[PDB]
Structure formats: structure tokens, C-alpha cells
CSV table of C-alpha atoms in Angstrom, one decimal:
chain,number,residue,atom,x,y,z
A,1,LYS,CA,-152.7,-5.2,-19.5
A,2,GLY,CA,-153.6,-8.8,-19.4
A,3,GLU,CA,-150.5,-9.9,-21.2
A,4,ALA,CA,-148.3,-8.1,-18.7
A,5,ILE,CA,-150.2,-9.5,-15.7
A,6,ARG,CA,-150.0,-13.0,-17.1
A,7,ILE,CA,-146.2,-12.8,-17.8
A,8,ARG,CA,-145.6,-11.4,-14.3
A,9,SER,CA,-147.7,-14.2,-12.8
A,10,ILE,CA,-145.8,-16.8,-14.8
A,11,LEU,CA,-142.5,-15.4,-13.5
A,12,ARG,CA,-143.8,-15.4,-10.0
A,13,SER,CA,-144.8,-19.0,-10.4
A,14,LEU,CA,-141.4,-19.9,-11.8
A,15,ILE,CA,-139.4,-18.2,-9.0
A,16,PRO,CA,-140.6,-18.2,-5.3
A,17,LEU,CA,-139.7,-15.1,-3.3
A,18,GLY,CA,-138.1,-17.2,-0.6
A,19,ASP,CA,-135.5,-18.6,-3.0
A,20,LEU,CA,-134.4,-15.1,-4.0
A,21,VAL,CA,-134.3,-13.9,-0.3
A,22,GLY,CA,-132.3,-16.9,0.7
A,23,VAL,CA,-129.8,-16.6,-2.2
A,24,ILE,CA,-129.4,-12.9,-1.3
A,25,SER,CA,-128.9,-14.0,2.4
A,26,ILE,CA,-126.1,-16.4,1.3
A,27,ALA,CA,-122.8,-15.0,2.8
A,28,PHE,CA,-119.6,-14.2,0.9
A,29,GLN,CA,-116.0,-15.5,1.3
A,30,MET,CA,-113.9,-12.7,2.7
A,31,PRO,CA,-110.3,-11.6,1.9
A,32,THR,CA,-108.2,-12.2,5.0
A,33,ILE,CA,-104.8,-11.1,6.2
A,34,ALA,CA,-102.4,-13.9,7.0
A,35,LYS,CA,-100.0,-13.8,9.9
A,36,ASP,CA,-97.3,-12.7,7.5
A,37,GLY,CA,-99.4,-9.7,6.5
A,38,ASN,CA,-99.9,-10.7,2.8
A,39,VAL,CA,-103.5,-10.7,1.5
A,40,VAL,CA,-105.0,-14.2,1.3
A,41,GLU,CA,-107.5,-13.5,-1.5
A,42,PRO,CA,-110.0,-16.1,-2.7
A,43,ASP,CA,-110.2,-16.8,-6.4
A,44,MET,CA,-113.6,-15.3,-7.3
A,45,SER,CA,-113.8,-17.1,-10.6
A,46,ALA,CA,-114.1,-20.4,-8.6
A,47,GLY,CA,-116.7,-19.3,-6.1
A,48,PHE,CA,-119.8,-17.3,-5.2
B,1,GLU,CA,-170.3,-36.1,-45.1
B,2,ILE,CA,-168.1,-34.2,-42.7
B,3,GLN,CA,-170.1,-32.4,-40.0
B,4,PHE,CA,-168.6,-29.6,-37.9
B,5,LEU,CA,-168.7,-28.6,-34.3
B,6,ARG,CA,-171.1,-25.8,-33.4
B,7,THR,CA,-172.1,-23.8,-30.4
B,8,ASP,CA,-174.8,-25.3,-28.0
B,9,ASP,CA,-173.5,-28.8,-28.7
B,10,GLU,CA,-173.0,-31.4,-26.0
B,11,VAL,CA,-169.5,-33.0,-26.2
B,12,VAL,CA,-167.0,-35.0,-24.1
B,13,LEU,CA,-163.3,-34.4,-24.0
B,14,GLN,CA,-161.4,-37.7,-24.3
B,15,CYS,CA,-157.7,-38.4,-23.9
B,16,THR,CA,-155.7,-41.5,-24.6
B,17,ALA,CA,-153.5,-42.9,-21.8
B,18,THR,CA,-150.7,-45.5,-22.4
B,19,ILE,CA,-150.0,-47.1,-19.1
B,20,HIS,CA,-148.2,-50.5,-18.8
B,21,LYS,CA,-148.1,-50.6,-22.7
B,22,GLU,CA,-151.9,-50.6,-23.1
B,23,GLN,CA,-154.5,-48.0,-24.0
B,24,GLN,CA,-157.2,-46.3,-21.9
B,25,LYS,CA,-159.7,-43.7,-23.1
B,26,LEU,CA,-160.5,-41.2,-20.3
B,27,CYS,CA,-163.2,-38.5,-20.3
B,28,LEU,CA,-162.7,-35.2,-18.5
B,29,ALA,CA,-165.2,-35.4,-15.6
B,30,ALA,CA,-166.1,-33.1,-12.7
B,31,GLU,CA,-168.6,-33.4,-9.8
B,32,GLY,CA,-169.4,-29.7,-9.6
B,33,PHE,CA,-171.4,-30.0,-6.3
B,34,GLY,CA,-169.2,-30.2,-3.2
B,35,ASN,CA,-166.0,-30.4,-5.4
B,36,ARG,CA,-164.4,-28.2,-8.0
B,37,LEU,CA,-161.4,-30.2,-9.2
B,38,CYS,CA,-161.6,-32.1,-12.4
B,39,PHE,CA,-160.7,-35.8,-12.8
B,40,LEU,CA,-160.7,-38.6,-15.3
B,41,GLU,CA,-163.4,-41.2,-16.0
B,42,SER,CA,-162.5,-44.4,-17.8
B,43,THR,CA,-164.6,-45.3,-20.8
B,44,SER,CA,-162.5,-48.0,-22.4
B,45,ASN,CA,-163.8,-50.5,-19.9
B,46,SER,CA,-167.5,-49.8,-20.5
B,47,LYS,CA,-168.3,-53.5,-20.8
B,48,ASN,CA,-167.3,-54.3,-17.2
B,49,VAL,CA,-167.8,-50.9,-15.6
B,50,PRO,CA,-170.3,-48.2,-16.8
B,51,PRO,CA,-168.8,-44.8,-17.2
B,52,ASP,CA,-170.5,-41.7,-15.7
B,53,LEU,CA,-170.9,-39.5,-18.8
B,54,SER,CA,-173.5,-37.3,-17.0
B,55,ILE,CA,-170.6,-35.4,-15.3
B,56,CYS,CA,-168.4,-35.7,-18.4
B,57,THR,CA,-170.7,-33.9,-20.8
B,58,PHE,CA,-169.9,-30.3,-21.6
B,59,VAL,CA,-171.8,-27.7,-23.7
B,60,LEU,CA,-170.0,-25.3,-26.1
B,61,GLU,CA,-171.9,-22.2,-25.1
B,62,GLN,CA,-169.8,-19.4,-26.8
B,63,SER,CA,-167.1,-19.4,-29.5
B,64,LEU,CA,-165.6,-15.9,-30.1
B,65,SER,CA,-162.3,-14.9,-31.7
B,66,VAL,CA,-159.4,-13.8,-29.6
B,67,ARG,CA,-159.9,-10.2,-30.4
B,68,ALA,CA,-163.6,-10.4,-29.7
B,69,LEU,CA,-162.8,-12.0,-26.3
B,70,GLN,CA,-160.2,-9.3,-25.5
B,71,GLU,CA,-162.8,-6.6,-26.4
B,72,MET,CA,-165.3,-8.3,-24.2
B,73,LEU,CA,-162.8,-8.5,-21.3
B,74,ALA,CA,-161.8,-4.9,-21.7
B,75,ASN,CA,-165.5,-3.9,-21.8
B,76,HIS,CA,-175.1,-21.7,-34.0
B,77,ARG,CA,-171.6,-20.5,-34.7
B,78,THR,CA,-169.4,-23.1,-36.2
B,79,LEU,CA,-166.2,-23.6,-34.2
B,80,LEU,CA,-163.0,-22.4,-36.0
B,81,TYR,CA,-159.5,-23.3,-35.2
B,82,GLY,CA,-157.9,-20.6,-33.1
B,83,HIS,CA,-161.2,-19.6,-31.5
B,84,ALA,CA,-161.6,-19.2,-27.8
B,85,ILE,CA,-164.5,-21.2,-26.5
B,86,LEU,CA,-166.5,-21.4,-23.2
B,87,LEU,CA,-167.3,-24.9,-22.0
B,88,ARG,CA,-170.3,-25.1,-19.6
B,89,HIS,CA,-170.5,-28.2,-17.5
B,90,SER,CA,-173.8,-29.9,-18.4
B,91,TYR,CA,-174.7,-31.2,-14.9
B,92,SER,CA,-173.4,-28.5,-12.6
B,93,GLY,CA,-174.0,-25.6,-14.9
B,94,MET,CA,-170.4,-24.3,-14.1
B,95,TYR,CA,-167.5,-23.7,-16.5
B,96,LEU,CA,-164.2,-25.4,-17.1
B,97,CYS,CA,-161.4,-23.0,-16.0
B,98,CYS,CA,-157.9,-22.6,-14.8
B,99,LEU,CA,-158.3,-22.7,-11.1
B,100,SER,CA,-155.1,-20.5,-10.5
B,101,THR,CA,-154.3,-23.0,-7.7
B,102,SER,CA,-151.8,-25.9,-7.7
B,103,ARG,CA,-151.9,-29.2,-5.8
B,104,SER,CA,-148.1,-29.1,-6.4
B,105,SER,CA,-148.1,-32.7,-7.6
B,106,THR,CA,-144.3,-32.4,-8.0
B,107,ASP,CA,-145.1,-29.9,-10.9
B,108,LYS,CA,-144.6,-26.3,-10.0
B,109,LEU,CA,-145.7,-24.8,-13.3
B,110,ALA,CA,-148.9,-26.8,-13.6
B,111,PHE,CA,-152.2,-25.2,-12.4
B,112,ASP,CA,-155.3,-27.2,-11.5
B,113,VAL,CA,-158.3,-27.6,-13.8
B,114,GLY,CA,-161.7,-27.2,-12.3
B,115,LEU,CA,-165.2,-25.7,-12.5
B,116,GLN,CA,-166.1,-22.0,-12.0
B,117,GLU,CA,-169.4,-20.4,-11.4
B,118,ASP,CA,-168.8,-17.0,-13.1
B,119,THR,CA,-168.1,-16.5,-16.8
B,120,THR,CA,-166.4,-13.2,-16.1
B,121,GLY,CA,-162.6,-13.1,-16.6
B,122,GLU,CA,-160.3,-15.0,-18.9
B,123,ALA,CA,-160.0,-18.1,-16.6
B,124,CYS,CA,-163.0,-19.9,-18.3
B,125,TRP,CA,-162.0,-19.4,-21.9
B,126,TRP,CA,-159.9,-21.9,-23.9
B,127,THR,CA,-158.4,-21.4,-27.3
B,128,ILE,CA,-158.6,-24.5,-29.6
B,129,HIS,CA,-155.7,-25.4,-31.8
B,130,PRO,CA,-155.1,-28.1,-34.4
B,131,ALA,CA,-153.5,-31.4,-33.4
B,132,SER,CA,-151.7,-31.9,-36.8
B,133,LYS,CA,-150.9,-30.0,-39.9
B,134,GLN,CA,-154.0,-31.4,-41.6
B,135,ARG,CA,-155.9,-28.4,-40.0
B,136,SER,CA,-155.0,-24.7,-39.9
B,137,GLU,CA,-156.0,-21.6,-38.1
B,138,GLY,CA,-159.5,-20.5,-39.2
B,139,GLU,CA,-160.4,-24.0,-40.6
B,140,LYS,CA,-163.7,-25.3,-39.4
B,141,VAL,CA,-163.4,-27.8,-36.5
B,142,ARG,CA,-164.6,-31.3,-37.5
B,143,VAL,CA,-166.1,-33.9,-35.2
B,144,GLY,CA,-163.3,-36.5,-35.6
B,145,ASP,CA,-160.6,-34.0,-35.0
B,146,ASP,CA,-158.1,-34.1,-32.1
B,147,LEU,CA,-157.7,-30.7,-30.4
B,148,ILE,CA,-155.2,-28.8,-28.2
B,149,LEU,CA,-156.7,-26.6,-25.6
B,150,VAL,CA,-154.8,-23.5,-24.3
B,151,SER,CA,-155.9,-21.6,-21.2
B,152,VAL,CA,-156.4,-17.9,-22.0
B,153,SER,CA,-155.7,-16.9,-18.4
B,154,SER,CA,-152.5,-19.0,-17.9
B,155,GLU,CA,-151.3,-19.9,-21.5
B,156,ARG,CA,-151.1,-23.5,-20.4
B,157,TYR,CA,-152.3,-26.7,-22.1
B,158,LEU,CA,-155.0,-29.0,-20.9
B,159,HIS,CA,-152.5,-31.6,-19.8
B,160,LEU,CA,-152.7,-35.3,-18.9
B,161,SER,CA,-150.3,-35.7,-15.9
B,162,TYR,CA,-148.5,-39.1,-16.1
B,163,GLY,CA,-145.9,-38.5,-13.3
B,164,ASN,CA,-148.1,-38.8,-10.2
B,165,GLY,CA,-149.4,-42.3,-9.5
B,166,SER,CA,-153.0,-41.6,-10.3
B,167,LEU,CA,-154.0,-40.2,-13.6
B,168,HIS,CA,-154.7,-36.4,-13.3
B,169,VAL,CA,-155.7,-33.5,-15.5
B,170,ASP,CA,-154.0,-30.2,-15.0
B,171,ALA,CA,-153.1,-27.0,-16.8
B,172,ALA,CA,-149.5,-27.5,-17.7
B,173,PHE,CA,-147.1,-26.7,-20.5
B,174,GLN,CA,-146.9,-30.2,-21.9
B,175,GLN,CA,-149.4,-30.9,-24.7
B,176,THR,CA,-152.2,-33.5,-24.7
B,177,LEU,CA,-154.3,-34.4,-27.8
B,178,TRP,CA,-158.0,-34.1,-26.8
B,179,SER,CA,-160.6,-35.7,-29.0
B,180,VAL,CA,-164.0,-34.0,-28.9
B,181,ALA,CA,-166.6,-36.8,-29.1
B,182,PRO,CA,-170.1,-35.5,-29.7
B,183,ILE,CA,-172.8,-36.3,-27.2
B,184,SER,CA,-175.9,-34.2,-28.2
B,185,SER,CA,-177.1,-31.4,-30.4
B,186,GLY,CA,-179.9,-29.5,-28.8
B,187,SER,CA,-181.5,-28.0,-31.9
B,188,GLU,CA,-181.9,-31.3,-33.7
B,189,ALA,CA,-183.4,-32.9,-30.6
B,190,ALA,CA,-187.1,-33.6,-30.8
B,191,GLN,CA,-189.4,-32.6,-28.0
B,192,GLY,CA,-191.3,-35.2,-26.0
B,193,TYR,CA,-189.1,-37.9,-27.4
B,194,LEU,CA,-186.8,-40.2,-25.5
B,195,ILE,CA,-183.1,-39.5,-25.8
B,196,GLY,CA,-180.1,-41.0,-24.1
B,197,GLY,CA,-179.1,-39.8,-20.6
B,198,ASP,CA,-182.6,-38.9,-19.6
B,199,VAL,CA,-184.0,-39.1,-16.1
B,200,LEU,CA,-187.4,-40.7,-16.2
B,201,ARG,CA,-190.1,-42.6,-14.3
B,202,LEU,CA,-191.4,-46.0,-15.5
B,203,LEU,CA,-195.2,-46.0,-15.1
B,204,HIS,CA,-196.6,-49.5,-15.1
B,205,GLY,CA,-200.4,-49.6,-14.6
B,206,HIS,CA,-203.3,-47.2,-15.4
B,207,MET,CA,-200.7,-44.4,-15.2
B,208,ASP,CA,-200.5,-45.5,-11.5
B,209,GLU,CA,-197.3,-47.3,-10.4
B,210,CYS,CA,-193.6,-46.6,-10.7
B,211,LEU,CA,-190.5,-48.9,-10.7
B,212,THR,CA,-188.8,-48.1,-7.4
B,213,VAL,CA,-186.9,-49.4,-4.4
B,214,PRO,CA,-187.8,-49.4,-0.6
B,215,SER,CA,-187.3,-46.2,1.4
B,216,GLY,CA,-187.7,-46.3,5.1
B,217,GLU,CA,-185.3,-49.2,5.8
B,218,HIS,CA,-182.2,-47.0,5.2
B,219,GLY,CA,-180.3,-50.2,4.6
B,220,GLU,CA,-178.9,-50.8,1.1
B,221,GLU,CA,-179.3,-54.5,1.3
B,222,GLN,CA,-183.0,-53.9,1.6
B,223,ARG,CA,-182.9,-51.1,-0.9
B,224,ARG,CA,-181.4,-53.3,-3.7
B,225,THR,CA,-184.8,-54.9,-4.3
B,226,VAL,CA,-187.0,-53.5,-7.1
B,227,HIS,CA,-190.8,-53.3,-7.1
B,228,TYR,CA,-193.8,-51.4,-8.4
B,229,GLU,CA,-195.3,-48.8,-6.1
B,230,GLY,CA,-198.0,-46.1,-6.3
B,231,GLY,CA,-198.6,-42.9,-4.5
B,232,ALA,CA,-196.1,-40.1,-3.7
B,233,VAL,CA,-193.3,-42.2,-5.3
B,234,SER,CA,-194.3,-40.6,-8.6
B,235,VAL,CA,-193.0,-37.3,-7.2
B,236,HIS,CA,-190.3,-38.6,-4.9
B,237,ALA,CA,-186.7,-39.2,-6.0
B,238,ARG,CA,-186.7,-43.0,-5.7
B,239,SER,CA,-188.6,-43.5,-8.9
B,240,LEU,CA,-185.9,-41.7,-10.9
B,241,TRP,CA,-184.0,-43.8,-13.4
B,242,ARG,CA,-181.1,-42.8,-15.7
B,243,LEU,CA,-181.3,-44.2,-19.2
B,244,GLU,CA,-177.7,-44.7,-20.4
B,245,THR,CA,-176.7,-46.1,-23.8
B,246,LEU,CA,-173.8,-48.5,-24.3
B,247,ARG,CA,-172.0,-46.0,-26.4
B,248,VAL,CA,-170.0,-42.9,-25.7
B,249,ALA,CA,-170.3,-41.0,-29.0
B,250,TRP,CA,-173.9,-39.8,-29.6
B,251,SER,CA,-175.1,-41.3,-26.3
B,252,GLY,CA,-177.4,-38.3,-26.1
B,253,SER,CA,-179.2,-39.2,-29.4
B,254,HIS,CA,-182.7,-40.5,-29.7
B,255,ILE,CA,-183.4,-44.0,-28.4
B,256,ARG,CA,-184.8,-46.5,-30.9
B,257,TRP,CA,-186.7,-49.7,-30.3
B,258,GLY,CA,-184.4,-52.6,-29.5
B,259,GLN,CA,-181.4,-50.4,-28.6
B,260,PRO,CA,-179.6,-51.9,-25.6
B,261,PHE,CA,-179.1,-49.7,-22.5
B,262,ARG,CA,-178.5,-49.6,-18.8
B,263,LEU,CA,-181.0,-48.3,-16.1
B,264,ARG,CA,-179.4,-46.5,-13.1
B,265,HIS,CA,-181.4,-45.8,-10.0
B,266,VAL,CA,-180.5,-42.1,-9.5
B,267,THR,CA,-180.8,-41.9,-5.7
B,268,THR,CA,-178.7,-45.0,-5.0
B,269,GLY,CA,-176.4,-44.8,-8.0
B,270,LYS,CA,-176.8,-48.6,-8.6
B,271,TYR,CA,-177.6,-50.3,-11.9
B,272,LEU,CA,-180.6,-52.6,-12.5
B,273,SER,CA,-179.5,-56.2,-13.2
B,274,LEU,CA,-181.0,-59.6,-13.7
B,275,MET,CA,-179.3,-62.1,-11.4
B,276,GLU,CA,-178.7,-65.8,-12.1
B,277,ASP,CA,-181.8,-66.5,-9.9
B,278,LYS,CA,-183.6,-64.3,-12.5
B,279,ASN,CA,-184.6,-61.7,-9.8
B,280,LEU,CA,-184.1,-58.0,-10.3
B,281,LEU,CA,-181.3,-56.5,-8.1
B,282,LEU,CA,-179.6,-53.2,-8.0
B,283,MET,CA,-175.8,-53.7,-8.0
B,284,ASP,CA,-172.7,-51.5,-7.9
B,285,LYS,CA,-171.1,-49.8,-10.8
B,286,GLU,CA,-168.0,-52.0,-10.6
B,287,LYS,CA,-170.1,-55.2,-10.6
B,288,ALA,CA,-172.4,-53.9,-13.4
B,289,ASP,CA,-171.6,-55.5,-16.7
B,290,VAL,CA,-173.2,-55.5,-20.2
B,291,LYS,CA,-174.6,-59.0,-20.1
B,292,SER,CA,-176.6,-58.6,-17.0
B,293,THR,CA,-177.4,-54.8,-17.0
B,294,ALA,CA,-178.5,-54.5,-20.6
B,295,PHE,CA,-182.2,-53.8,-21.3
B,296,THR,CA,-184.2,-52.8,-24.4
B,297,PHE,CA,-187.5,-51.1,-25.1
B,298,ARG,CA,-189.8,-52.9,-27.5
B,299,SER,CA,-193.1,-51.8,-29.1
B,300,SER,CA,-194.7,-55.3,-28.8
B,301,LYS,CA,-194.1,-58.2,-26.5
B,302,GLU,CA,-194.1,-60.7,-29.4
B,303,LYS,CA,-190.7,-62.3,-29.9
B,304,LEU,CA,-189.8,-60.4,-33.1
B,305,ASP,CA,-186.1,-60.3,-32.2
B,306,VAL,CA,-185.1,-57.7,-34.9
B,307,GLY,CA,-181.4,-58.0,-34.1
B,308,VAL,CA,-178.5,-55.7,-34.4
B,309,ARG,CA,-178.9,-52.5,-36.5
B,310,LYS,CA,-176.2,-50.2,-37.8
B,311,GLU,CA,-175.3,-47.5,-35.3
B,312,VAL,CA,-176.2,-43.9,-36.3
B,313,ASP,CA,-173.6,-41.2,-35.9
B,314,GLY,CA,-176.2,-38.5,-35.2
B,315,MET,CA,-179.5,-37.8,-33.5
B,316,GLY,CA,-181.2,-40.3,-35.8
B,317,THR,CA,-185.0,-40.7,-35.9
B,318,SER,CA,-187.2,-40.1,-32.9
B,319,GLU,CA,-189.0,-43.4,-32.2
B,320,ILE,CA,-190.0,-43.6,-28.5
B,321,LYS,CA,-192.5,-40.9,-27.3
B,322,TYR,CA,-192.9,-39.8,-23.7
B,323,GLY,CA,-196.2,-40.9,-22.2
B,324,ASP,CA,-197.8,-41.8,-25.5
B,325,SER,CA,-195.6,-44.8,-26.5
B,326,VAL,CA,-196.2,-48.1,-24.7
B,327,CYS,CA,-192.9,-49.9,-24.0
B,328,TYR,CA,-192.0,-53.4,-23.0
B,329,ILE,CA,-188.7,-53.9,-21.1
B,330,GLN,CA,-186.7,-56.9,-22.3
B,331,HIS,CA,-183.4,-58.2,-21.0
B,332,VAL,CA,-181.0,-58.4,-23.9
B,333,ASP,CA,-178.8,-61.4,-22.9
B,334,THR,CA,-181.7,-63.6,-21.7
B,335,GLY,CA,-184.6,-62.2,-23.7
B,336,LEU,CA,-186.8,-62.2,-20.6
B,337,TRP,CA,-189.6,-59.7,-20.0
B,338,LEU,CA,-189.9,-57.5,-16.9
B,339,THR,CA,-193.2,-58.4,-15.2
B,340,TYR,CA,-194.9,-57.7,-11.9
B,341,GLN,CA,-195.2,-60.7,-9.5
B,342,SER,CA,-198.9,-59.9,-9.0
B,343,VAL,CA,-198.8,-61.2,-5.4
B,344,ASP,CA,-200.6,-59.5,-2.6
B,345,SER,CA,-198.2,-48.9,-1.2
B,346,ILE,CA,-199.4,-51.5,-3.7
B,347,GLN,CA,-195.9,-53.1,-3.6
B,348,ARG,CA,-196.1,-55.6,-6.5
B,349,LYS,CA,-192.7,-57.3,-6.9
B,350,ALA,CA,-190.9,-57.0,-10.2
B,351,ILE,CA,-189.5,-60.2,-11.7
B,352,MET,CA,-188.3,-61.5,-15.1
B,353,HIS,CA,-190.6,-64.0,-16.8
B,354,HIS,CA,-190.3,-65.5,-20.3
B,355,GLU,CA,-193.7,-64.4,-21.5
B,356,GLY,CA,-195.0,-62.2,-18.7
B,357,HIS,CA,-198.6,-61.2,-18.3
B,358,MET,CA,-201.0,-59.4,-20.7
B,359,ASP,CA,-200.4,-55.9,-19.2
B,360,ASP,CA,-196.6,-55.3,-19.0
B,361,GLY,CA,-196.5,-52.0,-21.0
B,362,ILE,CA,-194.5,-49.2,-19.5
B,363,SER,CA,-195.1,-45.5,-20.1
B,364,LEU,CA,-192.2,-43.1,-19.7
B,365,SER,CA,-192.4,-39.8,-17.9
B,366,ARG,CA,-189.5,-37.4,-18.2
B,367,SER,CA,-188.4,-35.7,-15.0
B,368,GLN,CA,-187.6,-32.0,-14.6
B,369,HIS,CA,-184.0,-30.9,-14.7
B,370,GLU,CA,-184.3,-29.4,-11.2
B,371,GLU,CA,-185.7,-32.7,-9.8
B,372,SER,CA,-182.9,-34.7,-11.5
B,373,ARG,CA,-180.2,-32.4,-10.2
B,374,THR,CA,-181.7,-32.5,-6.7
B,375,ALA,CA,-181.7,-36.3,-6.8
B,376,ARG,CA,-178.0,-36.5,-7.8
B,377,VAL,CA,-177.1,-34.0,-5.2
B,378,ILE,CA,-179.0,-36.2,-2.6
B,379,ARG,CA,-176.9,-39.2,-3.7
B,380,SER,CA,-173.6,-37.3,-3.5
B,381,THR,CA,-174.4,-35.8,-0.1
B,382,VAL,CA,-175.5,-39.2,1.2
B,383,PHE,CA,-172.2,-40.7,0.1
B,384,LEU,CA,-170.0,-37.9,1.6
B,385,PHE,CA,-171.9,-37.8,4.9
B,386,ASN,CA,-171.8,-41.6,5.3
B,387,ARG,CA,-168.0,-41.4,4.8
B,388,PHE,CA,-167.9,-38.6,7.4
B,389,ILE,CA,-169.9,-40.7,9.9
B,390,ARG,CA,-167.8,-43.8,9.3
B,391,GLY,CA,-164.6,-41.8,10.0
B,392,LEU,CA,-166.1,-40.3,13.2
B,393,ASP,CA,-167.1,-43.8,14.3
B,394,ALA,CA,-163.6,-45.1,13.7
C,1,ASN,CA,-139.1,-10.1,-27.6
C,2,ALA,CA,-139.5,-10.5,-23.8
C,3,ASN,CA,-143.0,-12.1,-24.3
C,4,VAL,CA,-141.8,-14.3,-27.1
C,5,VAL,CA,-138.8,-15.6,-25.1
C,6,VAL,CA,-140.9,-16.2,-22.0
C,7,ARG,CA,-143.4,-18.2,-24.0
C,8,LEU,CA,-140.7,-20.3,-25.6
C,9,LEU,CA,-138.9,-20.9,-22.3
C,10,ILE,CA,-142.1,-22.0,-20.6
C,11,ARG,CA,-142.9,-24.3,-23.5
C,12,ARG,CA,-139.5,-25.9,-23.1
C,13,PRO,CA,-139.2,-26.1,-19.3
C,14,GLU,CA,-135.9,-27.9,-19.4
C,15,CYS,CA,-134.3,-24.6,-20.4
C,16,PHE,CA,-134.4,-23.5,-16.7
C,17,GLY,CA,-132.0,-26.2,-15.4
C,18,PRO,CA,-132.1,-29.1,-12.9
C,19,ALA,CA,-133.4,-27.0,-10.0
C,20,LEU,CA,-136.2,-25.4,-12.0
C,21,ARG,CA,-137.1,-28.5,-14.1
C,22,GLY,CA,-140.4,-28.5,-12.1
C,23,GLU,CA,-140.4,-32.3,-11.6
C,24,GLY,CA,-138.5,-33.6,-8.6
C,25,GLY,CA,-135.9,-30.8,-8.7
C,26,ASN,CA,-134.9,-28.8,-5.6
C,27,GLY,CA,-135.2,-25.0,-5.3
C,28,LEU,CA,-132.9,-22.3,-6.6
C,29,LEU,CA,-131.5,-21.8,-3.2
C,30,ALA,CA,-130.7,-25.5,-3.0
C,31,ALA,CA,-129.0,-25.3,-6.4
C,32,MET,CA,-126.9,-22.3,-5.2
C,33,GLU,CA,-125.9,-24.2,-2.1
C,34,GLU,CA,-125.0,-27.4,-4.0
C,35,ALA,CA,-123.0,-25.3,-6.4
C,36,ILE,CA,-121.2,-23.8,-3.3
C,37,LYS,CA,-120.4,-27.3,-2.1
C,38,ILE,CA,-119.2,-28.3,-5.6
C,39,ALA,CA,-116.9,-25.2,-5.8
C,40,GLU,CA,-115.3,-25.9,-2.4
C,41,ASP,CA,-115.0,-29.6,-3.2
C,42,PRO,CA,-111.9,-30.0,-5.5
C,43,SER,CA,-112.8,-33.4,-6.8
C,44,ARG,CA,-116.3,-32.4,-8.0
C,45,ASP,CA,-115.0,-29.1,-9.4
C,46,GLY,CA,-111.9,-30.0,-11.4
C,47,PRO,CA,-111.4,-32.5,-14.2
C,48,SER,CA,-109.4,-34.8,-11.9
């Protein structure tokens, strides 16, 4: 379908594949254990 | 009354550019040979620099509805708003299209606009839409209307790109109002009759000589001289002259006696001009201005001096006949007549003199389309290869 | 609805945000990285 091909091409033009691959490659912040043993947990609502 | 756009009509797509708080009119132009990308040609400054409408003219070949176009893709009509049209470039014979490639002129969404050789596919079809509410879908398209062109393949507008330093045309999502100025109507055109934009030869004597420039020197300073010569010049490309009117709209109409025009040597691309010394010289497009490069065809050498006539918004009457009609070339600003020097490959120099001689009549011989295209291709190839040679020398 | 929304969004390109403005804007990965830097910078994140 020409409409479907055109819409897919438009979306491909909007978003390069490299951008998606890089954003997926972005690393996360990890919950760590402090020297006391309590969990130092990042606030996910303020981060990636 | 109002007249409507039809198929097989020659038109130019004009856009209005406001840079530094001032207006320019720019025609969509393309040099199909050796280049595909479209550009812009200024027509607002016609007085000081002639525009090149030969590469700007387009022909409305087909005008089908959206459903008819989709049926074709799966497998003199008046233009209607909402129709998908096929624009064929008059000079190159190619078609305006969405190139599906981007120069990435800091605009990711925009595609480039250029010429394509194949009509197959949806890249060469453009839907036409009204500029204002005064027109509606299905309404007949009128000559004075402004239009919005949408690419069928990319659903993008024919857009005028301000952001980059040079003015560009590209298929983007911002809208640009395109006026469709009529150039020619093939059906109304009369055969054997002179019309604007023609490539022709100016035969002087007993059907013998041609107005031409020197050949073997290969030096443009020596080539700028204009003379009368007989022999194989009548079949060579040097004797080819473009007849260009001083108007954009209806430039392709019939030429009348006393209508001012510019003569362009096709091979060199330079315009004929009377210099202050009263000699004939070919000079550049930038230097070519109305006062010096304007010439008229007259039926008799007697100083009738008819004057300015109302300008016709159509083909008008066919007055000047190819071969049959005897024409006298007069400079408009000075009133001088173009006459051979008559001094001793005849090679009689062409000068301007205020009464001339008894035999200054000029017959006109139209050139074939193949010959004209070959001459313009020769000019373009010469220009590009000279640039290449200069770069290699540097 | 998908086709209509895509058409409207591409007609108004500013709906895609500063990264995807399509004129002088950086990529989606750059936008994500700048957002990361904003999130881990307290001054640019909070009202202050």
C-alpha cells in the first residue's frame, strides 16, 4: 500500500536508526549497597 | 473574461521572496542536462539582467484525479483544484519530481526537488490546491490564481527555503504560494509564424548569409564580434539566435511588428547589444540591459515609429511569417537600423547606421528542436569543461 | 487515526520538540544526553 509505504518512509526520515540504537545503548544508574548495608536506591522519577 | 489552465499549456511557476524587506519574483528553473536539482531564476530584475525562461518553462502534460492516478499506479482537460498533474520540463523533456534525496540544508524533513526521466511512479505527480478560500476543490483553476503543490510521493509542499543563505526550492512541510504564469498554448499557436522563445537564423542576402560570430579563434574576445557569413554557418550552431521578449507572462505568444525583444547567441549565451561606439557586441547576461539589448522587427525601414501598443494577454495575432516576411532590425533606444558594413566566408561586418542601405531585409528560418537542444547542450558542456580545466590548471 | 495524526504532526513540525525541530536542532540521542545532564545537575533541574 502506497500510503503505508509513505508513512513508514516519513517516520524513518523523522527518526534515524542510529539515534534509537544510541539511546538504547545508554546505560542505567544502578542500585548499590552502602558500607552500612542499606540499599542506596536512586530516585527513578528524577532520572533515566 | 477569465480563462482557465488546460493540459498541454506552457507555464512558469513563480514565487515571491521577501529578503531585506523587498520583493523578488523567482521562477522555478532546472538545467536538466548534467544536473537534476532545481533552482531559482530571478525575473524581477529583467531590466538589468535577462531571465532564462527557456529552462523555467514547464508543460502541463497530464491532469488526472487522485483516484485515477492511484488506479494507474496500481495498474485539453481543464485543470481542477485537487487534481494531480504531471509537469514536463520544456527544455530537457524531463519531469518535476520529489528526488527522495536531501541535501540536508539544516532541514531533515525536506526532500530535494529535481527532474526525472521516467513518468512511472508517484514521484512526478503533484496535487494542486487553492491558495485561499476564494477557490474550492473541484473548481476550475484560473490563470491568475496562486497554487499550493503537494508531492504525491512524499506528501510535502513545493517549498521556498529561506533559512539557508542562498534561495532554494525543496519539498518540505512549510507552504509556499506558487503563481502559475502562462507562457504558451500549443493549440492556439499558428504554424510557420514567429513566437517568443524561438531559436532562429537571420538570413540577410539572397537567402545566402547568416548573422553569426567567429569560430576558429576559440577566444571569446574575438567571438564577441558580430558579422554576416555564408556557407555551412546556415547549418552550424553559431547562427542560432534566441528571440526573447521583455515580458514573463505570455512570452511564448506571437511576435508583432515593433515588439521589443532581446537576441541571444545560443552557442555563447551572450546577448546582442549596441555599444556607445555604435558597434554590435555580444555581452554577458549580467551586463545586458533593456536600453542596449532591445531590438524590434519592422515591416518597412521607413521611420513610421508606431509607438507603444497595449500588451495582449494571450497568443494574439500572428504577424511575422517564417521565411516569407521580410524584416528590418531596429534598435529600440537609438532607432538605428542593423546594416552590413559592405567592406571587402563572405564576412561582411554588421554595424548600426541611421538609414542603412537599400537591402537590409532579414528573413527568418526557424531551427529544429533537436538542433536547438544540441546547441544549448554544447554551451553548457563548454562552460562546465572550461571550469574543470581552470580548476586543474590551478 | 494513525495516518491523520502523522499528517498533522508533520504539518506542524514543532510538535516533535527542540531536538526534532529539523532546523539547527541536535539529535534524539543528544536530547537524551542533555536531559541526563539536566537531571544530574540540581540547579537546572529544580526550581531553585
